Structures are given as C-alpha cells and as structure tokens.
Write a protein that binds this ligand. Sequence first.
Ligand SMILES: Nc1ncnc2c1ncn2[C@@H]1O[C@H](COP(=O)(O)OP(=O)(O)OP(=O)(O)O)[C@@H](O)[C@H]1O
Length: 237
Amino acid sequence: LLGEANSFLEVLEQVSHLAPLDKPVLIIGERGTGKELIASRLHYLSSRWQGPFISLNCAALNENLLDSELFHPGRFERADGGTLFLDELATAPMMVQEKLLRVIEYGELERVGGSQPLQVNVRLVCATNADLPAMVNEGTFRADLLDRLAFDVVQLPPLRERESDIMLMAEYFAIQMCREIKLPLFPGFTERARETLLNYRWPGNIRELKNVVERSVYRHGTSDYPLDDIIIDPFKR
Ligand SMILES: Nc1ncnc2c1ncn2[C@@H]1O[C@H](COP(=O)(O)OP(=O)(O)OP(=O)(O)O)[C@@H](O)[C@H]1O
C-alpha cells in the first residue's frame, strides 16, 4: 500500500485497531480509493486471517438475486469463520438491508421451512460513496440498519485530498510500466506533466491514476527524454 499522506496514515492506524474486533465496519470513499484493499487488510490483520475472505459487490448481480446470493448458497455461508466485504451498499434493496440488519442483530441466516436457521460467525465490512445519513433521510437507506451497522467508519481520502501522494504513486506506476515495456530507466516527469497530474481532480482516484500513467509511459515510449504528455483522456486522441 503506497502513501505517506497524514490522512492515509491515520486510516491505516485506525484499521490496525479495528481489525481485531468482530464488529462491523463501514468504509466511505470514492471509486478507486482503495476501499477493497482496506477491507482485505481488516481481514488479514484480524484473528480471522486464516479464515476465508469472501467479497461481493452488490452491483455485480441482479437486484432480485442479491438475497439468495447473500443469504444456491450464500456469501455469509462461505465467509463463516472469516470475513465478508460488501461493496456498493447504498444500492441494496431495503429488504436485503432489513435482512442484513437481522443477520447482524441475530447472527443467523433465516430459513423458510424444513431447514432450521443457519448460525454463522462472520465479520462484516461494507463500503460506499453516498452520504448514508443522507440516504436515511431520503427514505433510501434504513435508519435502523445504519444505527447498527456503522460501529465505526473509515473515511478514505480521495487522491485530490492526498495531493502529496499523487507524485509518489505516479512515479511508482511509471516505473512498473517501464519494466513492462522494457525501458532501461523511467526518465522522469516534466513540470508540465506534474502540473497536469496535480491539477486534475482524479474522479477515478488511484485506479485512474495507474491507467493514466501507464498509458502515458507507453505513448512516450522512451528513456531518452522526460515524460511531458500525460494522456488523461484517451477518447480525445
Ligand atoms: N494505497 C494504494 N497503493 C497502491 N495501489 C492502490 C492503493 N489504493 C488503491 N490502489 C489501487 O487502485 C485500484 C483500486 O483499489 P480498490 O479496488 O481497493 O479501490 P475501491 O475503492 O475498492 O474501488 P471501487 O469501489 O471503485 O471498486 C487497485 O488497482 C488498487 O491496487
């Protein structure tokens, strides 16, 4: 994990204290900010580290199949003894959100008839970029679920608020790309390059930075001169 920005370092410190708890954690941050990497850290730094790390994006699946996917068997079942990461929570159906509250509140998976309810031992982590308290007031997120799910909140800073890290990360990603394309040395970034990198708002944050930098190193294609042209938008040219 790259970064030295105070705001990022306070997140890592926080994660180190939260990881051993069995309490549910909410991660707030923009796309591409490393929320999944932090969730993975919460799992590997916990007592449950030898246990499974199951993950699921509540947008990587049809709305009507969330239920049965979550609770065919489900992610909870798979994460038993382990940890479950749920990205994109602010677009889960209310019923899944009320059922989610029940699994949190009661520690067991509801079973209709026949089978008795299934006891699970799962550390939960969720992630989003909504003002969840705003979705509660909007009738789009359950006030009761939030009152219990947000035991604590990890706020991951966007890249534009970790401005000291933009060049550190850009240089790392550029060097890795130089290795991929067999250039002998990364020749550096011009000041024009650095202005471009630092003045851009990075709506896709670290994912976007890596792709931008890699593309730019490739287009440049040489170690003879410093990299001047940062290609933010490949759809222009
Ligand atoms: N601190 C970091 N150091 C190096 N790479 C990072 C860092 N944080 C994120 N990245 C990289 O950026 C990309 C996105 O990270 P990740 O998927 O964890 O973020 P995310 O917030 O979960 O994104 P999204 O919700 O949009 O899927 C990945 O390539 C990841 O390796």
